[PDB]
RNA sequence: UUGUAUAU
């Protein structure tokens, strides 16, 4: 299967082997764990001539290398370090194959790299081969990263077809493991006319989303980078449910984000809710201090509370200081209290 | 080591 040259190379016979020396063996070396490695760490520092010599032998069979466990790395280097003309010729070897490559283990990595370095016209042509297959790519283990990459790299205007495809399925995709990722990229890079409908659906299913294994990340994303209007809507869903949600493995993280990113008024209201409300005989704050997840919310509340409110929180915590030591999680609250005594 | 998500 291997040639004399590659054979002797594996056998560590050419410790000083150079690029020009493997002319006529590029494809063979490229599809070889050691060969590829060798080529990879030469193209970056090699000369334009050495790179063209390598390019000449991989252009025709480029697809073959793109979907190759070791070859995909060489093609990637050309997009990263190759010349404009080489990147363009590789982009043409990809034409008509975007979908199958995007769904490919190795191929999707080439597509992702190509999207970063080719011109907008080449990006738009690539993106368009995904037209009609958006959800399939989004739900694919390989394809979801190509979609994420398009959103990061391509002009928003050319991604309208991905937006049209998410309409009505935002809730479904936000609880999907790859989908929640694409939704976040959409919120960070797309246009107002595009993020608007996505946000409406996110607001409509906020209650379910905060508690979802994946949806909770999308809601936090909005609390951390969203417009104040959108943040307040999320906060108003949390209000009245601080106690119950802070005790939830998933929503607890969302109430922390609310505490941290709410407006001054909203923050005070959230903290007060658990400083006033009584959970049985003892306050809601006390039940929270003893919970495996809620204790984190209290600590965050102590951190962001205005000195006036922090004082109130400490006072509600005070009478319980000695009992807290007996609870697996209350203890952790004591630790936090050290920072303040 | 008090608590949740990405691929050769």
Curated annotation (Swiss-Prot):
Chain spans, region Adenine-nucleotide binding in RNA target: 36-40, 108-112, 180-184
Tissues/organs with expression: Expressed in brain, heart, kidney, muscle, intestine and stomach. Not expressed in cerebellum, corpus callosum, caudate nucleus, hippocampus, medulla oblongata and putamen. Expressed in all fetal tissues tested.
Residue ranges, annotated region (Non-specific-nucleotide binding in RNA target): 144-148
Cell compartment(s), UniProt: Cytoplasm; Cytoplasm, P-body; Cytoplasmic granule
Location of region: Guanine-nucleotide binding in RNA target: 252-256
Impact reported for residue 310 to W: In SCA47; decreased post-transcriptional repression of E2F3 and ATXN1
Domain of life according to the entry: Eukaryota
Region described as Uracil-nucleotide binding in RNA target: 72-76, 216-220, 295-299
Triggers of expression: Strongly down-regulated in keratinocytes upon UVB irradiation.
Pumilio repeats: 21-56, 57-92, 93-128, 129-164, 165-200, 201-236, 237-272, 276-315
Span of domain PUM-HD: 1-341
Role of this protein: Sequence-specific RNA-binding protein that acts as a post-transcriptional repressor by binding the 3'-UTR of mRNA targets. Binds to an RNA consensus sequence, the Pumilio Response Element (PRE), 5'-UGUANAUA-3', that is related to the Nanos Response Element (NRE). Mediates post-transcriptional repression of transcripts via different mechanisms: acts via direct recruitment of the CCR4-POP2-NOT deadenylase leading to translational inhibition and mRNA degradation. Also mediates deadenylation-independent repression by promoting accessibility of miRNAs.
Domain notes: The pumilio repeats mediate the association with RNA by packing together to form a right-handed superhelix that approximates a half donut. RNA-binding occurs on the concave side of the surface. PUM1 is composed of 8 pumilio repeats of 36 residues; each repeat binds a single nucleotide in its RNA target. Residues at positions 12 and 16 of the pumilio repeat bind each RNA base via hydrogen bonding or van der Waals contacts with the Watson-Crick edge, while the amino acid at position 13 makes a stacking interaction.
Summary of subunit composition and partner proteins: Recruits the CCR4-POP2-NOT deadenylase leading to translational inhibition and mRNA degradation. In case of viral infection, interacts with DHX58. Interacts with TRIM71 (via NHL repeats) in an RNA-dependent manner.
Known disease link: Spinocerebellar ataxia 47: A form of spinocerebellar ataxia, a clinically and genetically heterogeneous group of cerebellar disorders. Patients show progressive incoordination of gait and often poor coordination of hands, speech and eye movements, due to degeneration of the cerebellum with variable involvement of the brainstem and spinal cord. SCA47 is an autosomal dominant disease with a highly variable phenotype and incomplete penetrance. Clinical features include developmental disability, ataxia, and seizures. Neurodevelopmental disorder with motor abnormalities, seizures, and facial dysmorphism: An autosomal dominant disorder characterized by global developmental delay, impaired intellectual development, early-onset seizures, poor overall growth, delayed walking, hypotonia and/or ataxia, and facial dysmorphism. Some patients have hypoplasia of the corpus callosum and cerebral atrophy.
Entry protein name: Pumilio homolog 1
Organism: Homo sapiens (Human)
Gene (name only): PUM1
First-to-last residue of the parent protein present: 828 to 1168 of 1186
